[PDB]
Amino acid sequence: DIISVALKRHSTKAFDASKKLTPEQAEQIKTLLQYSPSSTNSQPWHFIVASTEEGKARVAKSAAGNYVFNERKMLDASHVVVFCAKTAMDDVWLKLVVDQEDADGRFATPEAKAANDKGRKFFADMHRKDLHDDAEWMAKQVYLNVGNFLLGVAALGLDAVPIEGFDAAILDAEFGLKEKGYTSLVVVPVGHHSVEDFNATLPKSRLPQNITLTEV
Amino acid sequence: DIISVALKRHSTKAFDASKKLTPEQAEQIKTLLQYSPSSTNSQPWHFIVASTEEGKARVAKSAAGNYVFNERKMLDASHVVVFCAKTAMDDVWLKLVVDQEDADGRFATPEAKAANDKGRKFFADMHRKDLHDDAEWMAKQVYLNVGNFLLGVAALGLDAVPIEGFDAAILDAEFGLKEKGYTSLVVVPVGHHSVEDFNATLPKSRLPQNITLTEV
Ligand SMILES: CC1=CC(C)=[N+]2C1=C(c1cc[n+](Cc3ccc([N+](=O)[O-])cc3)cc1)c1c(C)cc(C)n1[B-]2(F)F
Numbered sequence: 001d002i003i004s005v006a007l008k009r010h011s012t013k014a015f016d017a018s019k020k021l022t023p024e025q026a027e028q029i030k031t032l033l034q035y036s037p038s039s040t041n042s043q044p045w046h047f048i049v050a051s052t053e054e055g056k057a058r059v060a061k062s063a064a065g066n067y068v069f070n071e072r073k074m075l076d077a078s079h080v081v082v083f084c085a086k087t088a089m090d091d092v093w094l095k096l097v098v099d100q101e102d103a104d105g106r107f108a109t110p111e112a113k114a115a116n117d118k119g120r121k122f123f124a125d126m127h128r129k130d131l132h133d134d135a136e137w138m139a140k141q142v143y144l145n146v147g148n149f150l151l152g153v154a155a156l157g158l159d160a161v162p163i164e165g166f167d168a169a170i171l172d173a174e175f176g177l178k179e180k181g182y183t184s185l186v187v188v189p190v191g192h193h194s195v196e197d198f199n200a201t202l203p204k205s206r207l208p209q210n211i212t213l214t215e216v
Numbered sequence: 217d218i219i220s221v222a223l224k225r226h227s228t229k230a231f232d233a234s235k236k237l238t239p240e241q242a243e244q245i246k247t248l249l250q251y252s253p254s255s256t257n258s259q260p261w262h263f264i265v266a267s268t269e270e271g272k273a274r275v276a277k278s279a280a281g282n283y284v285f286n287e288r289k290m291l292d293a294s295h296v297v298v299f300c301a302k303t304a305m306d307d308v309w310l311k312l313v314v315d316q317e318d319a320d321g322r323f324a325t326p327e328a329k330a331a332n333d334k335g336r337k338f339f340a341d342m343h344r345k346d347l348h349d350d351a352e353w354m355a356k357q358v359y360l361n362v363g364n365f366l367l368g369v370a371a372l373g374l375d376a377v378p379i380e381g382f383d384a385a386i387l388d389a390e391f392g393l394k395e396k397g398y399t400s401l402v403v404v405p406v407g408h409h410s411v412e413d414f415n416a417t418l419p420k421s422r423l424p425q426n427i428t429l430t431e432v
């Protein structure tokens with residue numbers, strides 16, 4: 001199932017504006033973003049899904065300067081996801097993680113809740129106090145979600161492309177992510193490709209396993 | 217159904233050592249690692265898949281210090297992959313990627329290749345000179361590959377777990393990395409779950425969409 005899905009999914013370079021997402025797939029697109037794994041269930045992310053031609057326009061302002069080639073993907077596609085990560089990891093936000101676990105039924109007795117809180121506060125203190133790469137630590141959790149997402153919509157029969165070529169500073173101001181405490185990382189449109197997408201036609205290229213893989 | 221994949225996948229806490237992956241799953245292990253997307257198709261990664269008990273043993277040395285609780289996962293699983301990323305982005309890896317694309321037939325005229333090649337060195341030079349996030353860029357792409365991998369193995373009917381609690385320095389010395397020009401980031405075992413894995417039983421926990429998601 002998944003092997004040939006991974007072998008034909010491709011970064012679409014041109015979208016068909018009229019092919020809109022099913023009312024329900026517009027809710028499973030929501031579902032794949034939430035139920036993705038994260039270091040100690042940190043989930044240090046926030047998502048802005050733009051489905052309107054008012055919302056899709058505000059994001060595409062980001063694709064300025066040397067990013068002009070990525071703007072039609074922002075507009076022509078039906079549903080545009082903007083991946084964001086926390087700037088810094090506060091104590092109350094990790095309190096929110098465990099309490100949500102508590103309500104969802106992961107702990108029998110109270111002892112386990114405290115333990116996880118500090119199993120989390122071990123790794124958190126490891127990165128936010130000793131290594132001082134918490135921003136980057138949290139960012140890598142979201143690129144994992146990106147990867148989870150790009151295979152998800154592909155198997156769901158939807159076209160998509162991941163994009164980093166955008167001016168984060170404006171997208172941060174446009175939706176005030178600096179004020180909330182977040183930073184844009186990757187913009188993934190999803191929709192349906194036009195035959196104006198020259199990548200649907202071209203064969204996939206990877207480097208051979210003898211270069212990339214080691215068996216022991 | 218891929219949505220049911222995201223709702224039934226779980227971080228396995230105990231593997232059954234007997235149930236080994238079939239050689240076809242053992243040839244499918246490699247393709248998901250190979251055919252994952254990449255920013256400018258850099259693919260700044262290397263994978264060590266350890267398939268026999270002595271190969272699995274060398275990896276499990278990482279989880280010997282204050283990470284012992286994660287060590288049996290590396291021991292009982294059948295195929296253990298440790299994701300690695302390049303230290304620094306050389307010019308020749310940019311040379312081999314595009315040359316490999318040319319060999320697979322992506323460029324009609326030679327001019328298209330050169331355009332593709334430096335559009336790559338636009339992002340590359342930006343991260344190695346302008347941004348200073350030479351390593352962190354070569355790290356986030358493989359966390360993305362992890363994400364693609366974690367849903368692949370779930371949909372493949374396989375049990376898996378991401379691991380960060382390991383001594384990167386030890387495993388890098390163990391297989392003589394960074395001299396290689398690579399770095400361990402995450403260790404992913406995959407195999408089949410044992411009766412001792414009480415994570416398969418617990419209800420999935422996430423933060424509610426009202427917290428993490430904004431529709432515009
Ligand atoms: C998986 C598991 C294995 C064993 C031997 N037990 C359990 C759980 C259990 C309880 C709480 N948590 C918090 C937690 C959640 C996520 C992450 N994370 O992946 O980050 C870390 C920690 C995890 C597992 C459990 C329950 C509910 C009752 C009993 C007696 N047990 B257990 F027998 F101790």
Ligand SMILES: Cc1cc2nc3c(=O)[nH]c(=O)nc-3n(C[C@H](O)[C@H](O)[C@H](O)COP(=O)(O)O)c2cc1C
Nearest residue numbers: 009010011070162163164165252253254255256257
């Ligand atoms: C993090 C990330 C960022 C990307 N950014 C862009 C981009 O800015 N512009 C673009 O045309 N493609 C972008 N891509 C698509 C890649 O060029 C593409 O995945 C790679 O060439 C392999 O092609 P494939 O998606 O068909 O496997 C990005 C991919 C990733 C993973």
Ligand SMILES: Cc1cc2nc3c(=O)[nH]c(=O)nc-3n(C[C@H](O)[C@H](O)[C@H](O)COP(=O)(O)O)c2cc1C
Nearest residue numbers: 037038039040041225226227286378379380381402
């Ligand atoms: C990057 C990453 C690193 C992880 N490292 C560990 C780890 O070191 N030990 C562990 O028990 N679980 C680890 N996990 C599993 C997470 O705790 C788990 O994904 C999270 O609690 C949600 O659980 P789920 O995988 O069942 O959806 C890791 C997960 C990710 C994504």
